[PDB]
């Protein structure tokens, strides 16, 4: 590739929708979401993409069923747990201010070397963008100090973001880093994610026209 | 026009393209602006007669003015007409932008309160000046509601800083052709790809 984002945002998107079209309970698919991940860092580290920021789960997500929460917070859990058996700079933003939010997970909410490190990985957990937003407006001396103060701070602009599952919108992941992403959606379901995925989505990405400014 | 079961409340338009448009009919960059004028009185026809309540179009950025200064008139006196064709019209106009500057055209400050469909333009708007303008109750865009659908002309699949509060869960739809090359037919679509949702 020519051209390649410093920082890509993953929406893995369509675990409830897949289960179903397999014959399975919805709450059955987000465990079939943890290996995805894994190919989606291990061909970013291959291309040296320098940041991954991973949507886990929003405070939105946790007003579904209990079946379905314990589901997605173990396979978060987990994904996390797997990528720190690698080379990665682990980050983990959301939340700690809540029952819901993992205890496994809070090692992970100061940038955490694992391995060899170099390529930074970031999941929402427990994250909500209003949660992020207002966390500023708390005690700052100023709008200047706000947009510095959120709480997903330490994660930069977000250059090119994907989402599996066939839905074209945010889900509120990042509004302050999301402002000038490509947004590119694939029609699969996350489970069913293949590399030719990302690859189309690094292709969309360098095939933008770098005339036409923001 | 087709019949809808399900409706937006609110439509935000980012009509893109003015210049990749003008550059391929062998016009200067800066000459496409001024042919996006009536395609927004036709979106704005279109929205009237389906009875959608609430349009908001990107009009211009703080960030669009470091563009050449003859694309900044250009697109500047473009936003200016339009806003004026729908004053003539039935509907009650807001202009939200950072009024506290130069750039912002004084024929457009009598907008920046609604009158009396709502009919939103951003106009030296820029996401920064809005977050930094209860805080959330506070932003300077917070007379806008939540967008249930944004419609993007120009190919480009992207919010660029529009209104990032009311976009976090806006289905988008993407028109390829650029925004002088509007047809009816890309809003129906836009509105058959919203219900089908
Ligand atoms: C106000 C609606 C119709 C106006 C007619 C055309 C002039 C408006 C300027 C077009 C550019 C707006 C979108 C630019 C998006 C971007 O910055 O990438
Ligand atoms: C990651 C999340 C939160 C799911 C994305 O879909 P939405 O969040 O937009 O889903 P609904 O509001 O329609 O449930």
New interface residues.
């Given amino acids: 590739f020519k051209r390649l984002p410093r920082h890509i945002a993953i929406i893995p998107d369509g675990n409830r929708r897949w289960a179903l079209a397999r014959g399975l309970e919805k709450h059955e698919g987000y465990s079939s979401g943890i290996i995805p991940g894994l190919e989606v860092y291990d061909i970013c580290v291959k291309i040296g993409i320098g940041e991954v920021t991973f949507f886990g789960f929003t405070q939105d997500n946790t007003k579904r069923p209990q079946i379905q929460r314990k589901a997605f917070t173990d396979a978060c859990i987990k994904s996390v747990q797997e990528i720190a058996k690698r080379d990665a700079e682990i980050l983990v933003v959301g939340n700690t201010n809540s029952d819901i939010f993992p205890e496994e997970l809070l090692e992970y909410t100061k940038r955490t070397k694992v391995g060899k490190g170099k390529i930074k990985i970031n999941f929402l957990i427990n994250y909500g963008?209003?949660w992020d937003?207002?966390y500023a407006?708390d005690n700052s001396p100023d709008?200047?100090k706000?947009?510095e103060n959120i709480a997903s701070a330490e994660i930069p602009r977000v250059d090119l973001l994907i989402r599996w599952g066939g839905?074209?919108?945010?889900?509120?992941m990042l509004?302050?880093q999301?402002?000038?992403?490509?947004?590119?959606?694939v029609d699969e379901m996350w489970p069913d994610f293949k590399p030719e995925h990302l690859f189309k989505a690094l292709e969309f990405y360098q095939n933008?026209?770098i005339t036409?400014?923001?």
């Fill in positions: 963008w209003y937003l207002t407006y709008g200047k706000m947009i839905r074209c919108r945010l889900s509120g509004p302050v999301t402002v000038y992403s490509d947004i590119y959606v933008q026209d036409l400014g923001g």
